């Protein structure tokens, strides 16, 4: 189920990493300070890649139209986004980043 993403140190604070999944939609792993989170990478408002957006605290701003989501709840934080993002709980064990295989 869980998928090994990378070493925690592979990500500088406040950055985002896209996680491609063969046969499935890509995911986005966000490093907020020393905390890690994961959601679907594709903005629910279009085809934009959230991992190519801007992170402000635990809110990811889409690069296309300025829509935004809370990376912890997946709920929209800014219009035009209205459809909640898929959230994937992450696990950091022994300086290693793991992202749940399933949503919620």
């Amino acid at each position: 189920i869980w998928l090994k993403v990378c070493a925690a140190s592979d990500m500088q604070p406040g950055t985002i990493r896209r996680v491609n999944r063969v046969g499935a939609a890509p995911l986005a792993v966000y490093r907020v300070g020393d905390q890690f989170y994961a959601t679907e990478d594709t903005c629910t408002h279009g085809i934009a890649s959230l991992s190519e957006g801007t992170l402000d605290g635990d809110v990811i701003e889409c690069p296309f139209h300025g829509g935004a989501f809370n990376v912890c709840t997946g709920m929209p934080a800014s219009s035009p986004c209205t459809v909640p993002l898929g959230v994937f709980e992450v696990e950091v064990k022994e300086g290693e980043v793991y992202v749940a295989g399933e949503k919620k």
């Binding site: 594709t42 629910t44 402000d56 935004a68 934080a77 219009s79």
Partner: protein
């Protein structure tokens, strides 16, 4: 807001009402008659500034926002209903279900990730008394009864009417209709003479301000309205004078009509009895956009059987429609239009000089401000905006 904040700040008794130039969201509104929409024949219309599409499938009505989620074009430019339960945008074939507005298919890219993950806005639609009502709001709708005048929905009440687009903001229509002194503009109506009506030129108020109206804050169905009681203790004016000289007289007919007049949210007037002692008039002033409204007129009469309904239907077409709905109310149409300029810059809401009978309008303005279910904004039309 929809109006200059410096203006709203001055209007402490009914700022929300002045702000509601596009109408009140989360209320039911009649937009057409049932016979106007047939099976599988989508119809377009604009309500509260929003372009909508209505269709009848298997006898039931469904309403979808007439704006594709993709590039914002109106689906109605070129209607493509390829299956009984869907409509396909003519541009890139995004397909939606009339039932829930869900984007179920995209002919130009059947593998799109958008399929099943987007939803076109839908609004509840309900037919009652041969009238089509749309709930221009969000979430589960309240009973239609809440937004209609008492008795309109009575089992035996036979409703017949007419609808048209009028060039004035809806509020100007509501106020003229509930205006106790506007009766002066009807002094020469054919209905007054041809139906031997008693019609004063106006009223000399009697009693205290509180006695001039009766506000209904709650009904068993949550109705919100105001009754005009100026004639309760007021003195009907039958002879108009200037400098003591009589220059005009009211009508001394035998039929007493308009015993009680009430206005209700979201903006529907009830005149009873009218235009004849055994009938009732219910009329809505529906916001289309900031400059126009639907003047949805209906005349109701209790009917116990099909014979009575038939007879009434005959009288409606031959007499009431042309003599009353048109012969009487046409003067209201241009009266409304005449107030457009004064309020167009929103300054009339500050500069108007009211007199006694306007207590009725003031009561309506306060009631509307306090009990409306939401202020429609241009942002609702283009797409709600919020920045974190």
């Amino acid at each position: 807001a929809n109006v200059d904040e410096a203006i709203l700040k001055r209007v402490k008794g009914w700022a929300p009402y002045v702000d509601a130039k596009l109408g009140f969201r989360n209320h039911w509104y009649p937009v057409m008659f049932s016979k106007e929409i047939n099976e599988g024949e989508p119809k377009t219309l604009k309500l509260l500034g929003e372009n909508l599409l209505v269709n009848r499938i298997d006898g039931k009505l469904y309403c979808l926002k007439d704006r594709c989620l993709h590039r914002g074009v109106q689906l109605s430019v070129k209607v493509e209903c390829k299956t009984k339960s869907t409509i396909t945008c003519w541009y890139h074939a995004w397909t939606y279900r009339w039932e829930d507005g869900v984007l179920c298919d995209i002919l130009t890219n059947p593998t799109s990730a958008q399929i099943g993950r987007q939803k076109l806005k839908t609004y509840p639609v309900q037919e009652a008394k041969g009238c089509v009502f749309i709930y221009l709001g969000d979430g589960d709708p309240p009973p239609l009864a809440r937004d209609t005048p008492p008795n309109f929905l009575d089992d035996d009440m036979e409703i017949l009417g007419k609808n048209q687009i009028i060039k004035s903001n809806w509020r100007l229509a509501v106020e003229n209709g509930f205006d106790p002194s506007h009766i002066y503009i009807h002094k020469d109506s054919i209905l007054v003479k041809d139906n031997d009506l008693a019609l004063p030129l106006g009223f000399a108020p009697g009693g205290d301000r509180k006695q001039q109206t009766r506000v209904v804050d709650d009904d068993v169905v949550g109705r919100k309205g105001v009754y005009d009681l100026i004639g309760e203790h007021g003195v009907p004016v039958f002879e108009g004078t200037i400098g003591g000289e009589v220059v005009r007289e009211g009508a001394y007919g035998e039929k007493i009509v308009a015993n009680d007049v009430s206005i209700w949210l979201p903006g529907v007037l009830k005149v009873n009895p009218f235009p004849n002692p055994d009938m009732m008039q219910f009329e809505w002033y529906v916001p289309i956009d900031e400059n126009t409204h639907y003047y949805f007129q209906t005349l109701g009469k209790p009917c116990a059987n099909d014979e009575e309904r038939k007879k009434y239907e005959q009288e409606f077409e031959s007499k009431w429609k042309p003599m009353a709905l048109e012969g009487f109310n046409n003067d209201d149409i241009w009266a409304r239009e005449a107030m457009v300029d004064f309020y167009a810059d929103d300054k009339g809401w500050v500069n108007e000089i009211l007199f006694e009978s306007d207590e009725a309008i003031v009561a309506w303005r306060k009631l509307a401000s306090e009990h409306n279910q939401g202020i429609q904004t241009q942002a609702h039309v283009s797409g709600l905006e919020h920045h974190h």
